[PDB]
Design an enzyme around this catalytic site. Sequence first.
Site, PDB file in Angstrom:
ATOM      1  N   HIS A   1       1.036  -1.530   0.121  1.00 44.78           N
ATOM      2  CA  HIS A   1      -0.572   0.077   0.077  1.00 44.78           C
ATOM      3  C   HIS A   1       0.831   1.787   0.068  1.00 44.78           C
ATOM      4  O   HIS A   1       0.745   2.490  -0.705  1.00 44.78           O
ATOM      5  CB  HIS A   1      -0.905   0.332   0.548  1.00 44.78           C
ATOM      6  CG  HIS A   1      -1.885  -1.247   1.129  1.00 44.78           C
ATOM      7  ND1 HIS A   1      -2.527  -1.450   0.222  1.00 44.78           N
ATOM      8  CD2 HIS A   1      -2.133  -2.059   2.336  1.00 44.78           C
ATOM      9  CE1 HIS A   1      -3.474  -2.331   0.169  1.00 44.78           C
ATOM     10  NE2 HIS A   1      -2.699  -2.926   1.668  1.00 44.78           N
TER      11      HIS A   1
ATOM     12  N   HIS B   1      -4.799  -3.705  -3.326  1.00 44.86           N
ATOM     13  CA  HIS B   1      -5.701  -4.624  -2.606  1.00 44.86           C
ATOM     14  C   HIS B   1      -6.262  -5.398  -3.915  1.00 44.86           C
ATOM     15  O   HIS B   1      -6.925  -5.703  -4.711  1.00 44.86           O
ATOM     16  CB  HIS B   1      -6.772  -3.265  -1.807  1.00 44.86           C
ATOM     17  CG  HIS B   1      -6.975  -3.338  -0.204  1.00 44.86           C
ATOM     18  ND1 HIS B   1      -7.509  -3.359   0.371  1.00 44.86           N
ATOM     19  CD2 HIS B   1      -6.658  -4.404  -0.034  1.00 44.86           C
ATOM     20  CE1 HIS B   1      -6.546  -3.098   1.707  1.00 44.86           C
ATOM     21  NE2 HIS B   1      -6.096  -4.339   2.312  1.00 44.86           N
TER      22      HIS B   1
HETATM   23  C1  LIG Z   1      -0.050 -10.234   9.088  1.00 41.38           C
HETATM   24  O1  LIG Z   1      -0.478  -9.758   7.757  1.00 41.38           O
HETATM   25  C2  LIG Z   1      -1.956  -8.583   8.305  1.00 41.38           C
HETATM   26  C3  LIG Z   1      -3.258  -9.229   8.362  1.00 41.38           C
HETATM   27  C4  LIG Z   1      -4.167  -8.529   8.583  1.00 41.38           C
HETATM   28  C5  LIG Z   1      -3.825  -7.072   8.345  1.00 41.38           C
HETATM   29  S1  LIG Z   1      -5.937  -5.958   8.836  1.00 41.38           S
HETATM   30  O2  LIG Z   1      -4.981  -5.025   9.428  1.00 41.38           O
HETATM   31  O3  LIG Z   1      -6.440  -7.011   9.083  1.00 41.38           O
HETATM   32  N1  LIG Z   1      -5.783  -5.769   7.359  1.00 41.38           N
HETATM   33  C6  LIG Z   1      -6.902  -6.363   6.521  1.00 41.38           C
HETATM   34  C7  LIG Z   1      -8.510  -5.731   6.902  1.00 41.38           C
HETATM   35  C8  LIG Z   1      -8.342  -4.407   7.166  1.00 41.38           C
HETATM   36  C9  LIG Z   1      -9.776  -3.347   7.157  1.00 41.38           C
HETATM   37  C10 LIG Z   1      -9.489  -2.353   7.221  1.00 41.38           C
HETATM   38  O4  LIG Z   1     -10.684  -1.066   6.992  1.00 41.38           O
HETATM   39  C11 LIG Z   1      -8.302  -1.371   7.608  1.00 41.38           C
HETATM   40  O5  LIG Z   1      -8.636   0.089   7.919  1.00 41.38           O
HETATM   41  C12 LIG Z   1      -7.330   1.023   6.595  1.00 41.38           C
HETATM   42  C13 LIG Z   1      -7.243  -2.198   7.206  1.00 41.38           C
HETATM   43  C14 LIG Z   1      -7.473  -3.655   7.593  1.00 41.38           C
HETATM   44  C15 LIG Z   1      -5.544  -3.894   7.141  1.00 41.38           C
HETATM   45  C16 LIG Z   1      -5.123  -3.907   6.017  1.00 41.38           C
HETATM   46  O6  LIG Z   1      -5.377  -4.507   4.767  1.00 41.38           O
HETATM   47  N2  LIG Z   1      -4.336  -2.869   6.278  1.00 41.38           N
HETATM   48  O7  LIG Z   1      -3.139  -2.326   4.943  1.00 41.38           O
HETATM   49  C17 LIG Z   1      -2.904  -6.849   8.222  1.00 41.38           C
HETATM   50  C18 LIG Z   1      -1.462  -7.176   7.842  1.00 41.38           C
HETATM   51 ZN   LIG Z   2      -4.278  -3.930   2.987  1.00 44.26          ZN
END
Ligand SMILES: COc1ccc(S(=O)(=O)N2CCc3cc(O)c(OC)cc3[C@@H]2C(=O)NO)cc1
Ligand SMILES: [Zn+2]
Length: 173
Positions: free
Chosen positions: A124, A130
């Site tokens: 990102h 995404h």
């Molecule tokens: C270990 O690697 C991971 C696994 C899960 C996530 S997370 O924080 O659940 N993730 C997915 C769902 C979500 C959902 C959101 O609404 C969001 O808001 C910006 C962020 C995220 C993040 C993400 O995509 N960050 O870039 C981030 C990193």
């Molecule tokens: Zn993400």
Amino acid sequence: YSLFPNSPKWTSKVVTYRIVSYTRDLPHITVDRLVSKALNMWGKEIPLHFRKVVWGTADIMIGFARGAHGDSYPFDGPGNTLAHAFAPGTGLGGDAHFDEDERWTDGSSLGINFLYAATHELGHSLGMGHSSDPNAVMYPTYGNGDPQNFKLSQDDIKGIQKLYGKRSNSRKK
Ligand SMILES: COc1ccc(S(=O)(=O)N2CCc3cc(O)c(OC)cc3[C@@H]2C(=O)NO)cc1
Ligand SMILES: [Zn+2]
Ligand SMILES: [Ca+2]
Ligand SMILES: [Ca+2]
Ligand SMILES: [Zn+2]
């Protein structure tokens, strides 16, 4: 695709990073090595390079906190969202934040894979990327997408070749 109101990719061939805060589960040398290996794995598909600042905020600030912080969106701690990042476009754009409360691991067997998380977040930070594929490396909410080994699955390639290319399939979702 991944279209957002933010400049998808910086206008420089080289960018900067600044790890303001660090995790605790794994050492800072491992943070930098995993950032460098993850970013080398991004730069494996695109000729973009990265460097560190000497004294000033970088275009990719990387930071960690432990349940809430002084940012746009306070973290929660162990559960729900694990890390969040912003699209590039100067300023807070491109910067990425992680919940140190969530158990981080380089890649052993159990924990939250840092190499995957850094790759996800730094993606990102690079220029968005995404998707909603069953094994997407940027998949929202962990599941089938095996984090032990990802090395840019199909989502990453499709994002990068959609941003640094043109050709794409139609789908909705
Ligand atoms: C270990 O690697 C991971 C696994 C899960 C996530 S997370 O924080 O659940 N993730 C997915 C769902 C979500 C959902 C959101 O609404 C969001 O808001 C910006 C962020 C995220 C993040 C993400 O995509 N960050 O870039 C981030 C990193
Ligand atoms: Zn993400
Ligand atoms: Ca920034
Ligand atoms: Ca959390
Ligand atoms: Zn934040």
